[PDB]
Scaffold this motif. Structure first.
Motif: not given
Ligand SMILES: [Mg+2]
Ligand SMILES: [Mg+2]
Ligand SMILES: [Mg+2]
Ligand SMILES: [Mg+2]
Ligand SMILES: [Mg+2]
Ligand SMILES: [Mg+2]
Ligand SMILES: [Mg+2]
Ligand SMILES: [Mg+2]
Ligand SMILES: [Mg+2]
Ligand SMILES: [Mg+2]
Ligand SMILES: [Mg+2]
Ligand SMILES: [Mg+2]
Ligand SMILES: [Mg+2]
Ligand SMILES: [Mg+2]
Ligand SMILES: [Mg+2]
Ligand SMILES: [Mg+2]
Ligand SMILES: [Mg+2]
Ligand SMILES: [Mg+2]
Ligand SMILES: [Mg+2]
Ligand SMILES: [Mg+2]
Ligand SMILES: [Mg+2]
Ligand SMILES: [Mg+2]
Ligand SMILES: [Mg+2]
Ligand SMILES: [Mg+2]
Ligand SMILES: [Mg+2]
Ligand SMILES: [Mg+2]
Ligand SMILES: [Mg+2]
Ligand SMILES: [Mg+2]
Ligand SMILES: [Mg+2]
Ligand SMILES: [Mg+2]
Ligand SMILES: [Mg+2]
Ligand SMILES: [Mg+2]
Ligand SMILES: [Mg+2]
Ligand SMILES: [Mg+2]
Ligand SMILES: [Mg+2]
Ligand SMILES: [Mg+2]
Ligand SMILES: [Mg+2]
Ligand SMILES: [Mg+2]
Ligand SMILES: [Mg+2]
Ligand SMILES: [Mg+2]
Ligand SMILES: [Mg+2]
Ligand SMILES: [Mg+2]
Ligand SMILES: [Mg+2]
Ligand SMILES: [Mg+2]
Ligand SMILES: [Mg+2]
Ligand SMILES: [Mg+2]
Ligand SMILES: [Mg+2]
Ligand SMILES: [Mg+2]
Ligand SMILES: [Mg+2]
Ligand SMILES: [Mg+2]
Ligand SMILES: [Mg+2]
Ligand SMILES: [Mg+2]
Ligand SMILES: [Mg+2]
Ligand SMILES: [Mg+2]
Ligand SMILES: [Mg+2]
Ligand SMILES: [Mg+2]
Ligand SMILES: [Mg+2]
Ligand SMILES: [Mg+2]
Ligand SMILES: [Mg+2]
Ligand SMILES: [Mg+2]
Ligand SMILES: [Mg+2]
Ligand SMILES: [Mg+2]
Ligand SMILES: [Mg+2]
Ligand SMILES: [Mg+2]
Ligand SMILES: [Mg+2]
Ligand SMILES: [Mg+2]
Ligand SMILES: [Mg+2]
Ligand SMILES: [Mg+2]
Ligand SMILES: [Mg+2]
Ligand SMILES: [Mg+2]
Ligand SMILES: [Mg+2]
Ligand SMILES: [Mg+2]
Ligand SMILES: [Mg+2]
Ligand SMILES: [Mg+2]
Ligand SMILES: [Mg+2]
Ligand SMILES: [Mg+2]
Ligand SMILES: [Mg+2]
Ligand SMILES: [Mg+2]
Ligand SMILES: [Mg+2]
Ligand SMILES: [Mg+2]
Ligand SMILES: [Mg+2]
Ligand SMILES: [Mg+2]
Ligand SMILES: [Mg+2]
Ligand SMILES: [Mg+2]
Ligand SMILES: [Mg+2]
Ligand SMILES: [Mg+2]
Ligand SMILES: [Mg+2]
Ligand SMILES: [Mg+2]
Ligand SMILES: [Mg+2]
Lengths: 38, 174, 208, 141
Positions: D68-87
RNA sequence: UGCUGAAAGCAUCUAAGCACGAAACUUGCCCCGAGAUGAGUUCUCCCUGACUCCUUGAGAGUCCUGAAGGAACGUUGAAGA
RNA sequence: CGAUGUCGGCUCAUCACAUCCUGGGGCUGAAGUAGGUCCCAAGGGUAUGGCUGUUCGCCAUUUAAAGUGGUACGCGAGCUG
RNA sequence: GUGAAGAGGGAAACAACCCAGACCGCCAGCUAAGGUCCCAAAGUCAUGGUUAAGUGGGAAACGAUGUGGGAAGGCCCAGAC
């Protein structure tokens, strides 16, 4: 290389290896026999 | 298992030190340090070295059998010093050393200046051949592989950078 | 670092070979330093400058005291520049146009000219619908603004009619022509944002 | 008899420190979210913020099991046209290490004014030093 | 694509360790941006008077003082419905 | 069914990847040039005309490319009919 | 059988699935299905193992010295792999 869902040992020098989870078949004689996945 | 049960001989003038798991082997060629795995357990027994798998851990033999084979190469490295014989096949290709920077001309628009990390002693007996020496098998192997990866063998005339011991499969024109 | 300077129209320099290079005349007076911000107090290294001259009344006490701290005259407006580690300046120091003598290209930042409530045709380069061929009350309108049931909504950042211009904009890597030290000018090739009299934050080219 | 309910004025809120070095993220976050809500206290009332102020120092050094140090992703949308930011979990700690404990706790608390109110009490920190020396925040484990 | 290297005397890019590797991904470039209620920092400026009142409280009062500054009004603008 | 305006075009788009171009790779019956297939890659780009209501299609000439689809076969309280 | 004509608890939300049939009240206790680290009531409960894929938390033919159990079958001190 190929990415066929059923990789096999085609000739004698072919060899099965499991790298990064993926099963690959590496060969010394013919590079054609080199293949990935499955 | 079989490798693990085969003690490593330590010749004289080779100072071995075990800082817990962190091993330090000093010799005539160079001082080498190895941060070994926690699953492995290593000790001094008479003249030779002993490598034992730790109880509790799952894969001991696999981890120790590595350590054995590493320290076997690490002892031979500081004693003898490893070498690799690379050769440049093809007309117009040139290899010349100046200090610690190998000047590869491999038919490019720009002459390639390959740097040498760590204690790696590069030499040139001829202009179309690179013999390089050092302590570590790792760094030599890597350097050699980079120097190779600048121009791999063309499987037609065998042109590019090659290892001396390597065989290359060439094919015909169709 | 960079300097502040008022835009003073445009001219053309005739080069002796032939070319008539179009230049912007930027007057860049003695930009004098009001405050030197640093890592101990502020958490970053920078200088706050001033230029021109306010009348002895229009400047307020809070602003006029700020100038007494340094000792400089109350110049019109205040701006800041980030220091590039190596350079270090003192309070009450007068920087001149000679800083741009060595540089070749400059980023000029300014306030673009105010067009007002502009339509989608002007603002976003929308194509006007057929001027005739049946058209009814929808020549210069945007047309569609979305799909149907699916989004059930207009997406954010949709190009629509609104306020055009009167915004801070940067024209990058403008080639400097002449650096008049005596008249305190900085001639740059091309055209920079804002109308004659607008303030221009000039600085060396970040895109080197 | 009408049962006792804690009175917002009379609540005596305590301060604590938790060194999050070498701790399991979720099992830390759970115990944090337990205290922040005011569960451990015998005068617990669901409609009043009875819980304690906690300082979570050395948040960057928090540990995770598996891949999970690498595998675990934190998705969040930017509230925009197609802005899905992951990290990923590495990239999250690389930039903002306070966010990891924050997000891991926030989800475990309730959602609403009181839920946000009981998050305010949590004080995550990257460095070992904390500027809340004035409250005498005692050690908690 | 590799290097070293087991498990598996070897072998093999990996199971420990160590490298490369794309207009993708994170920055770099430009803009907005502390209503970022988690409302950050720096800088400067200005106010230093009395009294009663009761359920003595961040209570409510009363004579005086009205600052920094702002708004309003006017002339207006390459700013703007 | 006490109404959810049905094709095509224009204007405006937006997402998917099963990628048409551009970027990085393996094999090749890969000498080079040019391909062939396959793998990763959705950042950006992706004709103008003739004919017909056409979508499509054929044809002329370009282009690095002239991608396949979803979006009420996107979009008529935005236009055409 | 259930709904229709049946509320209540569970299955995230979910007429018909699982549990169970609301005469009215009470700030009593015991249980069903289903549950017991936090959102959210109750086991970071105990014993002996298995999984290394985030499987659990969608799927086939077929593919592979993945990894556990077993029950057998090929060779030794004339020293096989
Ligand atoms: Mg595939
Ligand atoms: Mg790895
Ligand atoms: Mg090749
Ligand atoms: Mg006045
Ligand atoms: Mg004014
Ligand atoms: Mg102003
Ligand atoms: Mg204007
Ligand atoms: Mg226009
Ligand atoms: Mg224009
Ligand atoms: Mg048009
Ligand atoms: Mg009409
Ligand atoms: Mg109309
Ligand atoms: Mg008209
Ligand atoms: Mg009409
Ligand atoms: Mg209309
Ligand atoms: Mg109308
Ligand atoms: Mg949908
Ligand atoms: Mg909706
Ligand atoms: Mg240029
Ligand atoms: Mg985007
Ligand atoms: Mg809730
Ligand atoms: Mg509050
Ligand atoms: Mg080996
Ligand atoms: Mg480019
Ligand atoms: Mg890039
Ligand atoms: Mg390029
Ligand atoms: Mg920046
Ligand atoms: Mg910026
Ligand atoms: Mg800016
Ligand atoms: Mg804008
Ligand atoms: Mg703006
Ligand atoms: Mg604002
Ligand atoms: Mg504020
Ligand atoms: Mg703060
Ligand atoms: Mg007083
Ligand atoms: Mg008082
Ligand atoms: Mg009062
Ligand atoms: Mg008064
Ligand atoms: Mg007044
Ligand atoms: Mg006064
Ligand atoms: Mg005044
Ligand atoms: Mg006044
Ligand atoms: Mg005011
Ligand atoms: Mg006027
Ligand atoms: Mg109706
Ligand atoms: Mg249409
Ligand atoms: Mg058309
Ligand atoms: Mg169109
Ligand atoms: Mg793909
Ligand atoms: Mg396909
Ligand atoms: Mg290639
Ligand atoms: Mg895109
Ligand atoms: Mg993307
Ligand atoms: Mg990028
Ligand atoms: Mg046309
Ligand atoms: Mg015609
Ligand atoms: Mg007709
Ligand atoms: Mg179509
Ligand atoms: Mg079609
Ligand atoms: Mg049809
Ligand atoms: Mg087509
Ligand atoms: Mg066509
Ligand atoms: Mg054609
Ligand atoms: Mg043609
Ligand atoms: Mg052509
Ligand atoms: Mg062409
Ligand atoms: Mg083509
Ligand atoms: Mg359809
Ligand atoms: Mg339609
Ligand atoms: Mg339509
Ligand atoms: Mg509509
Ligand atoms: Mg008609
Ligand atoms: Mg029911
Ligand atoms: Mg139910
Ligand atoms: Mg329910
Ligand atoms: Mg369930
Ligand atoms: Mg069930
Ligand atoms: Mg369900
Ligand atoms: Mg569930
Ligand atoms: Mg529920
Ligand atoms: Mg159901
Ligand atoms: Mg009954
Ligand atoms: Mg009970
Ligand atoms: Mg039960
Ligand atoms: Mg419940
Ligand atoms: Mg509980
Ligand atoms: Mg299951
Ligand atoms: Mg099979
Ligand atoms: Mg198996």
């Amino acid at each position: 290389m190929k990415v066929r869902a059923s990789v096999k040992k085609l000739c004698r020098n072919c060899k099965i290896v499991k790298r990064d989870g993926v099963i690959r078949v590496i060969c010394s004689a013919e590079p054609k026999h080199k293949q990935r996945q499955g | 298992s079989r490798v693990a049960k085969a003690p490593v001989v330590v010749p004289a003038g080779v100072d071995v030190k075990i800082n817990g798991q962190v091993i330090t082997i000093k010799g005539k060629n160079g001082e080498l340090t190895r941060t070994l795995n926690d699953a492995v357990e290593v000790k001094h027994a008479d003249n030779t070295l002993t490598f034992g798998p730790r109880d509790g851990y799952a894969d001991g033999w696999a981890q120790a059998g590595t350590a054995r084979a590493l320290l076997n190469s690490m002892v031979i490295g500081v004693t003898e010093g490893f070498t690799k014989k690379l050769q440049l096949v093809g007309v117009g290709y040139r290899a010349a050393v100046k200090g610690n920077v190998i000047n590869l001309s491999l038919g490019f628009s720009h002459p390639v200046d390959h740097q040498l990390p760590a204690g790696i002693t590069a030499e040139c007996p001829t202009q179309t051949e690179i013999v390089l020496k050092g302590a570590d098998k790792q760094v030599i192997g890597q350097v050699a592989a980079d120097l190779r990866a600048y121009r791999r063998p063309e499987p037609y005339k065998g042109k590019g950078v090659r290892y001396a011991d390597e065989v290359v499969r060439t094919k015909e024109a169709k | 670092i960079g300097l502040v300077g008022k835009k003073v129209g445009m001219t053309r320099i005739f080069t002796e070979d032939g070319v008539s290079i179009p230049v912007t005349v930027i007057e860049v007076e003695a930009n004098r330093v009001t405050q030197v911000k640093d890592l101990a107090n502020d958490g970053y290294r920078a200088i706050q400058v001033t230029t021109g001259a306010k009348k002895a009344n229009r400047v307020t006490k809070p602003e006029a005291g700020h100038f007494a701290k340094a000792g400089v005259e109350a110049g019109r407006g205040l701006w800041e520049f980030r220091l590039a580690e190596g350079e270090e300046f003192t309070v009450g120091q007068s920087i001149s146009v000679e800083l741009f003598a060595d540089v070749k290209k400059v980023d000029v930042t300014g306030t673009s000219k105010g067009k007002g409530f502009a339509g989608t045709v002007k603002r976003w380069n929308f194509r006007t619908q057929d001027a005739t061929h049946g058209n009814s009350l929808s020549h210069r309108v945007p047309g569609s603004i979305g799909q149907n049931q699916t989004p059930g909504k207009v997406f954010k950042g949709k190009k629509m009619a609104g306020q055009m211009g009167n915004e801070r904009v940067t024209v990058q890597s403008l080639d400097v022509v002449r650096v008049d030290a005596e008249r305190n000018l900085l001639l740059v090739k091309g055209a920079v944002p804002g109308a004659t009299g607008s303030d221009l934050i000039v600085k060396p080219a970040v895109k080197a | 008899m009408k049962t006792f309910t804690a009175k917002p004025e009379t609540v005596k809120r305590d301060w604590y420190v938790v060194d999050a070095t070498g701790k399991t993220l979720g099992r830390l976050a759970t115990e944090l979210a337990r205290r922040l809500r005011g569960k451990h206290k015998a005068e617990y009332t669901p409609h009043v913020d009875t819980g304690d102020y906690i300082i979570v120092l050395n948040a960057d050094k928090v540990a995770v099991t598996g891949n999970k140090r690498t595998d675990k992703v934190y998705y969040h949308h930017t509230g925009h046209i197609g802005g899905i930011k992951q990290a990923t979990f590495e990239e999250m700690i690389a930039r903002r290490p306070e966010r990891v404990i924050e997000i891991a706790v926030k989800g475990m608390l309730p959602k609403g004014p009181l839920g946000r109110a009981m998050f305010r009490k949590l004080k995550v920190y990257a460095g070992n030093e904390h500027n809340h020396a004035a409250q005498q925040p005692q050690v908690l484990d």
